[PDB]
Design a protein around this ligand. Structure first.
Ligand SMILES: CC(=O)C1=CCC[C@@H]2CC[C@H]1N2
Ligand SMILES: CC(=O)C1=CCC[C@@H]2CC[C@H]1N2
Ligand SMILES: CC(=O)C1=CCC[C@@H]2CC[C@H]1N2
Lengths: 205, 206, 206, 205, 206
C-alpha cells in the first residue's frame, strides 16, 4: 500500500512536459550508452543499415524524490516512460520509425535518479561499400535531442567504447569496433548543440 | 514550479480544434520550409518514390502568450503537437501514410511563436523514368492544409530554394534541383481557394 | 473566444453514437463522390488492385446548428471526425485495412451541413486480366454502410461520372472510365432496402 | 434525444469485462457463421494462406434490454464493439495479427440480441501443396474463445456449410468445399473443455 | 450484478504499476511455459527466424482476492492484461517488435491466482546454418523481465521440456527438440541479478 500511496502523491501535480530541474536555468544532464546486439542487414541497394541495440539513458528528476522511511522502505518505483519527462533522444539520420523491442518502463530511485533502457531496431543511412573485405566498412549515426538545446539538455557518455559484450555471436556481420563520442557544435543561434556520434566498423563474417 | 503553473494556466481553457486568432475573420499565416535528407527508394514498377526530410513549420498562436517576468523568467515551453492547434499540412499525392521519424513536440515562445519541425518519410507518386540519364527525372508534390481554405490558412516560404545542406552525400540519388513554391488552387468540392507549397525535385542516379 | 464557447456548448451533451436526426424514423442522406488519383498497382498473382483516391461525404447533422450572430459571426467549425457521428461507409470487397492519407477532420457549417473528405489507399478484389490489351481490364467495388439499413442511411451521388480530372498523369495505368452508381438492393432477410455506391473502373497499362 | 437517453441509461453501470448473463452459472451461447469472400494468397515457401471473410457473431446481452415505448420507439442501437462485452473469438493457428476490414460496431436490439459482423483478413498455417491439381489442397483453422471455457461460452453454428454466395468469382483460387464444424477440445493449461468452430477449406488454382 | 460489483471493488484503488505483493520485500514468482506452434520462416541472409507460439504465465496477485460467498459464488474474473499488473516478460534478442496473435485477457481466480497466455509471433536472432542437413540447426532466445530483478520477479518452469504437441505438422520446418531452462544473469548497469528462461530450439527443413 505504501508504494501505491507514493505513486499517487508523486504524480498528483507532476508534469511530463516540463524539464525536471528545480531552477529552469539549470541543464538536465543525460548520460547515454549503447549496447550493440546485432547488425541485422546492410542494404546496398538503398544504403540503409539495420541495427538492434539497447540504449541506456540516465538523468535525475528533481520532483521524483522521497524518503523511503515515509513509505515502508520503498526505494525504487517502476513507471511507464510516457508518464514522466524523458529526454527526446533521436537518431538524426534514420530512414524508418525506430521500432521498440522492450517495455517502455523507467526505473526511478528515491533520490530521483532515472534509468531508462529502451531496446530498439534502427534503420539509418549508410553505404556499406567495403563491408565484404577484411578491413570492413564504417558507418555513423548521430543521436541527440530533437527540440532541446545544449543549455537545456546536456549529453554525456561514461565511456566512448560501445558495449559489445552482448553482440550476437552468429550475426551475418562481424563487429570490428564501435565508439560513442560526444560532439558540441554551434550554428543563427547563440547556444551549443550536442549529439553523440555512433560509429560502427564491421564486415561480413 | 513556474513552468508547470504557466502550462496549467495556458491550457486550462485551451482548445486545439480552434484556429488561434484573436479574430476569426483573420488568417493564420504559416511559414513552411523543406530540408531534404535522402531519396531512399524509387520504384519504377509502381511509380512511387520515397523521400526523407524535415518540414519546418512556423506560425503564431494568439493564446500562447505570456510575460516571462510573471513566471520565473521562462521564455519557451515544449508541448506535444497533439495538444495545441496545428496546421493540418498534408502531402496531396502521398501513396502510403507518412511515417514520423522524430518526436512530435512543438516549441512555443512567450510571444506565442510556435515552431514545429517533424521529420518524415513520404512515399509519393513519381515516375523515375530518366533517372538513369544526365537529365534525370523530375517529380513534384503539393503540401497544404487539407481542410482550411486560404481565408483560414495562408502559406509562405522563406525562400523558394529547398535546403539541401543536410542531404545524404552517399544517397543513391543526386539532387539536381529542389524548389518549394507557393500556389493557389481550386477544388470542385469548395468555393474558396486553397493554398499549397509545391515541392519540385529533379534528381538522378549517382 | 467565441468558437471555443460554441464548441464547448455543441459537444456538452453530444453523442457520436446516435444518428444525427430530429426523430429516429428520419433517414440520414449521405452524398458520396470519388476523386480518383492513382492506380498504384494491379497484382496478377493475388488479384488485388491498389487505388488512391479521396472520397467526399456530405450530410446534415441536426444537432450541429447555431446562429453565427450569437457567436461573433462564426460560420463554421473544424472537428475531428472521431468526435461527431459519421456514416460508416465501407468498401465491401477490400483485402486490407484502408490506409488513411489525410487528417480526419470534418468541416461543419452553422446550418449543420457536414463535409468530410478522407483520402485513402484501398486494396480490393480485382482481376487485372486484359489490362495489357487495348480493351483493358474492368473492376468494381461497392461502398456502403456496414451496420445501417437504407431507412437509416441513404446514399446519393451528384453524378455517376467519377472525378478523374486529378488523376496522376504518369501512373503506370491509364483510366479508360470510372463510374460511381447508386444501387438499391432487396434481400429476403430484410423488408428495408440496402443501398450502396458501385465504383466501376476500366483501366489499362499506359 | 430519446436514443441518447437510452444509451446513457444502459451504460451508466455497464461493464464490458463481465459476461452478460443474469446467472453466473449460465453459459453465453454464441452463434458463429463464416462468409468466405476470397482466398487472396497461398504462400508455399512459408505455408501461410490468406483468407478474407465476414465472421457473423450473435448472442444475447441480458443487460442491454429496454422497452421501445419508453424511448420514442427506438428498437435498435449501434455501439462500438469495444464498449460492450464481446466474445473473444480467436483463430488458433494464425501467423499474423488478424486485420479488421470493417467498422467495429455492434448492433443491439431491444430484446438484448447482439449482432456483430467483423470482416477480416487472416494469415494462417496452411500447406497449399496440390493446389495446382484437380484434387486441390485442404487446410483448416479453429475459431474459438481464447480465455472462456465451454462452461462460460458455448459456440454453435446454424449450418455446417460455409456461406459461399459472396465468394469472389475471379479469385485466383476456387473453392471445392468449405465447412464450419463445432468442436470440443482440451488444452494442457486448463481442466475445462473449450469450444471452437473448425473451418475447413479445400481449394485449387 | 455480483461480478460487476466485485470488479468495481477490486479496482477502485488498484495500481497496475505496483508489484502485487503484500510486503515490497517479497518476490513475485512467475511460472512460464512455452507451446511452440510453427517455425514460419528462417532467413539466412539476415539470420532471423520467425516463431509462432503461446506462452503461459502464472502468478499470484495479492490484491485480487475475494470470498465467492460474498459475491454470488463468482470464482473467476476476466480482465484485460493492460488493467492489472503483469510481469514485463521480454525476449532479449528479438529483431522486430513481437506481434500479438491473441486477445490480451488475464484469468484471475478468487485466491488471486492469475493465468495469462498471450499467443505471439517473434522474430529473433538465429543462424539457420545446417537446417538443410540431418543434424539441423540450433538457436536460442532468453525470456525475462526487462526492468525487475530477481529480488522482485523470479521465474520458474514446471518442466524443461517444451510443449511440442501442438506443433504444426506441415510446417516447412520440423522441431527435433526444444527446451526451456531457468537462468540467472548479471549486468554491469545494475547491481542485482535478473532471471530468464532460455528457449533452445533445434530444427531442420522437413
Ligand atoms: C475540406 C476538404 O476536406 C478538402 C478541401 C479541398 C482541398 C483538398 C481536396 C479535398 C479536401 N482537401
Ligand atoms: C486461458 C487461456 O489463455 C487459454 C486457455 C485454453 C485455450 C487456448 C489455449 C491457451 C489459451 N487459449
Ligand atoms: C532497467 C532496464 O531496463 C534493464 C535492466 C537490466 C536488464 C536488461 C538489460 C538492461 C535492461 N534490461
Amino acid at each position: 500500500e505504501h508504494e501505491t500511496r507514493l505513486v499517487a502523491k508523486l504524480f498528483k501535480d507532476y508534469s511530463s512536459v516540463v524539464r525536471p530541474v528545480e531552477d529552469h536555468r539549470q541543464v538536465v544532464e543525460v548520460t547515454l550508452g549503447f549496447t550493440l546486439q546485432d547488425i541485422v542487414k546492410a542494404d546496398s541497394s538503398t544504403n540503409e543499415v539495420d541495427l538492434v541495440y539497447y540504449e541506456q539513458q540516465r538523468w535525475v528528476d528533481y520532483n521524483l524524490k522521497w524518503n523511503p522511511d515515509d513509505y515502508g522502505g520503498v526505494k525504487k518505483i517502476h513507471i511507464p516512460a510516457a508518464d514522466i519527462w524523458t529526454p527526446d533522444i533521436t537518431a538524426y539520420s534514420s530512414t524508418r520509425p525506430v521500432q521498440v523491442l522492450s517495455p517502455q518502463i523507467a526505473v526511478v530511485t528515491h533520490d530521483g535518479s532515472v534509468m531508462f533502457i529502451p531496446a530498439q531496431r534502427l534503420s539509418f543511412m549508410c553505404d556499406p561499400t567495403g563491408v565484404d573485405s577484411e578491413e570492413g566498412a564504417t558507418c555513423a549515426v548521430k543521436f541527440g535531442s530533437w527540440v532541446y538545446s545544449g543549455f537545456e539538455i546536456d549529453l554525456k557518455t561514461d565511456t566512448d567504447q560501445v558495449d559489445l559484450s552482448s553482440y550476437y555471436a552468429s550475426s551475418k556481420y562481424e563487429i570490428l569496433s564501435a565508439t560513442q563520442t560526444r560532439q558540441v557544435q554551434h550554428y543563427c543561434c547563440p547556444e551549443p548543440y550536442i549529439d553523440v556520434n555512433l560509429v560502427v566498423k564491421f564486415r561480413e563474417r
